[PDB]
Design a binder for these strands. Structure first.
Ligand code: FES
Ligand SMILES: [K+]
Ligand SMILES: [Mg+2]
Ligand SMILES: [Mg+2]
Ligand SMILES: [Mg+2]
Ligand SMILES: [Mg+2]
Ligand SMILES: [Mg+2]
Ligand SMILES: [Mg+2]
Ligand SMILES: [Mg+2]
Ligand SMILES: [Mg+2]
Lengths: 70, 137, 46, 96, 86, 92, 108, 99
RNA sequence: AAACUCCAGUUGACACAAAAUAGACUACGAAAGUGGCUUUAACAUAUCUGAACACACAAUAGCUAAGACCCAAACUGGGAUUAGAUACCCCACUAUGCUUAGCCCUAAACCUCAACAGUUAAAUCAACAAAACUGCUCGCCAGAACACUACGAGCCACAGCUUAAAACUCAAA
């Protein structure tokens, strides 16, 4: 899928989230998944340049209050 | 200070001394451990032969030369003849894979000399002369 | 670009005119080609 | 349907592993580097199972060592004692 | 011959433990392949025999490593029976 | 030669005995076979070849401890094939 | 092409070393060479004893002469390096910089 | 190989079964089973997965049908006359939870 | 036991010989072959197939001249051996293995797979070897033995190498 690319960058940049996956919950949302949704919303409501989208998504998540250690 | 397995080098100064002398001044015991005979020669650092003893010189004859006991006797004889010339510490240089490779060093130690280093100098050609054909026994 | 680089480099070549000066300068100089590599792939210069 | 998979190269593909000397130039004059791949006690060149180098760089190191040895830059029968305290990169232990 | 002496194949004795030094030298010579070279150089090995021996040794190493890998992989399954009785 | 398939599938006698005894002692003098075996310092008494040359019996001196004897026995049976290969490779 | 001459010279005093270096470079130019640089690696103990010109050497001075010469000069120069009595060992190789540093993607 | 037409794809080296096809296949299988049960046919469940032997035997007992979750001896079906009796009735339908 | 004692050990000087480790690599070359270092030349063909004989090459052994000679070694001597010894172990030393210029042209010269192009659907498929085939071309084969033979012909070969039958005989091979 398209988001896989984003996911890869996330898992290479911010690493695997300290929070544990819960695959029993049908509607679980990982930190990477929240990152992907914010990335897609920013893409659809703005321009398309991968790096600015990445940094802006990081800024927006930190604004919401999600910890992201590089 | 951590013990160094590697020998000292003549250039770089080192604090290792044996009876006040440095490494490159200790006498050298050259052991040749052949298949049928063993020969021990003690020389000084400046290559002065001090003592010599082989299994044939200690009375052992024919197949009895190539045994551990004979090499031990040769080592003891060389150790005595070198002790009579002021040798205590020695550097052992062994050559060959005969039965007396280690028995000579037992004899040398049992004769009173102290071994401070063991060196192997067995001739290993990088494919020079052609060896003989395998025996068809 | 290569020709221009060669042009700039030729000015420092040894010639029969500057043989003495360059020889003495070399005798008053030392270069080291030795360097080591770590398990992590990092160069360790002397 | 917009939810169907699309064709692309594996984005999670981990980059291929590289040897410690990948991208670096091996000179026959750099005796310090070449001495890291020979036996301290015999000077024998270590194989790739010990050095961990790739085949290309293993060949480069071998040719450089032989060239240095025959041109009078490196000893053959042992490793130069000046390089005995250099970093250890070879997977071998004599328990010395 | 032309090399400095007491550097190659040289081991220092610690606390007079000559036996340990000799055994360490033996280990060094064995793991560097010098002992095998000396033993093999007593008699001439014909080139075809040498080639066959090297091929056999290489393929034996490969086969043994593969079998060991298979056994280690299937050893994870060896445990107490979780569905005993059924 | 499909190695994967292969692996998947008297006066003379006295001289041979003496030669094999010397060769086996020489092999045991070093870690050439294995470091573990080298540690145990196994000593051989004699080597006897069967009259049909079907097996080589190497008589090794036993110690007084029983656990040491058992360990030596185990390593020896585990290393016999390697000794045979080494002996045949050295062209003894 | 571009060549590097590795020179192991006798362990001499400064004037003799300078004269020998001048003689070597003059021979190079006489054979048609354009010398780029003369580089000193230092005086050091040889890795082994070298017997040259009926004299045994344990130490020597290491020098590097980078130059451009015709393909025919090399052999001729080698002959000259065989006759000079102050050179322990002279060897001409293709300059290492000319070889291309091919890039690698890693172990397959 | 013969499972390929039923595979939606491979997700990071793990095959995924196409559930749209599974729905139709299950519909046909369940319809066949129901029709055979309506006709009073003998149904024998079979499975060698030891984790589910108890569950499958309980299910077979509950629905009034038969189960064989144990070691399958040679000749249960092709030699039933010698092994059960000359007038034994063989199953009319066999259901594999593990093939 | 013979042999050497102009012997043996350390040290120093010192090949027309063959090339530890790397190489657990699997590369170059038409094959044969090629694994010490440097340098110079240098690895044909923008369809494919295309020869016992045409044109160029061919491991090891062997033969001409010259040369070198550490080690190894057919033969040749000597030492030790039962009861017809050990052909086999030991010592000494030849042709030969090496170089230069010519011959000879044979190998389990084998991946025992003829060269190019294509396919993996079939029934996969006598057996084994090495999964089964298709298209196209050249070479070769039609029971065994006689016979890697005789004769003819050709060849730096003079017994050699290539090509290669027939008569009698058998029911098999
Ligand atoms: S892996 Fe790239 S040079 Fe070795
Ligand atoms: K073959
Ligand atoms: Mg053609
Ligand atoms: Mg024809
Ligand atoms: Mg030929
Ligand atoms: Mg010849
Ligand atoms: Mg001769
Ligand atoms: Mg020959
Ligand atoms: Mg053809
Ligand atoms: Mg004929």
């Amino acid at each position: 899928y398209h988001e896989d690319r984003i996911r890869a960058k996330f898992y290479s940049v911010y690493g695997s989230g300290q929070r544990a996956f819960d695959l029993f919950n049908p509607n679980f949302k990982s930190t990477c998944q929240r990152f992907v949704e914010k990335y897609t919303e920013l893409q659809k409501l703005g321009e398309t340049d991968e790096e600015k989208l990445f940094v802006e998504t990081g800024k927006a998540l930190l604004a919401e209050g999600v910890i992201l250690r590089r | 200070t951590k013990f160094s397995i590697y020998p000292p080098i003549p250039g770089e100064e080192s604090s290792l001394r044996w009876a006040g002398k440095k490494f490159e001044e200790i006498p050298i015991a050259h052991i040749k451990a052949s298949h049928n005979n063993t020969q021990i020669q003690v020389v000084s650092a400046s290559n002065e032969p001090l003592a010599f003893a082989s299994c044939g010189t200690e009375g052992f004859r024919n197949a009895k030369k190539g045994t551990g006991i004979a090499a031990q006797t040769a080592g003891i004889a060389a150790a005595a003849r070198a002790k009579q010339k002021g040798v205590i510490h020695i550097r052992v240089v062994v050559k060959g894979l005969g039965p007396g490779r280690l028995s000579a060093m037992h004899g040398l130690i049992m004769g009173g000399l102290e071994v401070i280093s063991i060196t192997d100098n067995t001739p290993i050609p990088h494919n020079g002369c052609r060896p003989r054909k395998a025996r068809k026994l | 670009r290569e020709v221009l680089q060669l042009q700039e480099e030729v000015k420092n070549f040894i010639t029969r005119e500057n043989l003495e000066a360059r020889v003495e300068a070399a005798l008053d100089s030392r270069k080291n080609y030795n360097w080591a590599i770590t398990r992590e792939g990092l160069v360790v210069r002397p | 349907n917009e939810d169907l998979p699309i064709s692309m190269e594996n984005p999670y593909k981990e980059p291929l592993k590289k040897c410690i000397l990948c991208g670096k130039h091996v000179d026959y004059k750099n005796v310090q580097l070449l001495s890291q791949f020979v036996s301290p006690f015999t000077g024998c060149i270590y194989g790739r199972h010990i050095t961990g180098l790739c085949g290309k760089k293993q060949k480069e190191i071998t040719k450089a060592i032989k060239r240095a040895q025959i041109m009078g830059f490196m000893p053959v029968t042992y490793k130069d004692p000046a390089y005995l305290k250099d970093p250890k990169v070879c997977n071998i232990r004599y328990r010395e | 011959a032309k090399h400095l002496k007491f550097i190659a194949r040289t081991v220092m004795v610690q606390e007079g433990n000559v036996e340990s030094a000799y055994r360490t030298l033996n280990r060094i010579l064995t793991m560097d392949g010098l002992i095998e070279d000396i033993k093999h150089r007593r008699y001439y090995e014909k080139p075809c025999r040498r080639r066959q021996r090297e091929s056999y040794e290489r393929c034996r190493r490969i086969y043994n490593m593969e079998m060991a890998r298979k056994i280690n992989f299937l050893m994870r399954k060896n445990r107490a029976d979780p569905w005993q009785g059924c | 030669k499909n190695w994967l398939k292969k692996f998947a599938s008297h006066a003379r006698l006295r001289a041979l005995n003496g030669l094999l005894y010397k060769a086996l002692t020489d092999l045991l003098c070093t870690p050439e076979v294995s470091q573990e075996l080298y540690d145990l310092n196994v000593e051989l008494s004699k080597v006897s070849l069967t009259p049909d040359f079907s097996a080589c019996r190497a008589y090794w001196k036993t110690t007084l401890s029983a656990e040491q004897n058992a360990h030596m026995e185990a390593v020896l049976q585990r290393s016999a094939a390697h000794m045979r290969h080494l002996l045949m490779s050295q062209q003894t | 092409p571009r060549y590097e001459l590795a020179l192991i010279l006798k362990a001499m005093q400064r004037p003799e070393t300078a004269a020998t270096l001048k003689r070597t470079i003059e021979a190079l130019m006489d054979r048609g060479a354009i010398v780029r640089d003369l580089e000193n690696l230092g005086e050091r103990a040889l890795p082994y004893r070298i017997s040259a010109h009926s004299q045994q050497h344990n130490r020597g001075g290491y020098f590097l002469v980078d130059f451009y010469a015709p393909t025919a000069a090399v052999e001729s120069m080698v002959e000259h390096l065989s006759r000079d009595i102050d050179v322990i060992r002279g060897n001409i190789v293709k300059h290492p910089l000319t070889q291309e540093l091919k890039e690698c993607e890693g172990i397959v | 190989r013969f499972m390929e037409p039923y595979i939606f794809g491979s997700r990071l080296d793990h095959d995924i079964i196409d559930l749209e096809q599974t729905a139709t296949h299950l519909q046909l299988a369940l319809n066949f089973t129901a029709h055979m049960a309506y006709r009073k046919g003998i149904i024998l469940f079979i499975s060698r997965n030891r984790q589910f032997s108890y569950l499958i035997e309980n299910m077979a007992r509950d629905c009034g049908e038969y189960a064989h979750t144990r070691y399958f001896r040679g000749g249960m079906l092709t030699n039933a006359r010698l092994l059960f009796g000359p007038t034994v009735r063989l199953p009319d339908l066999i259901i594999f939870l593990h093939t």
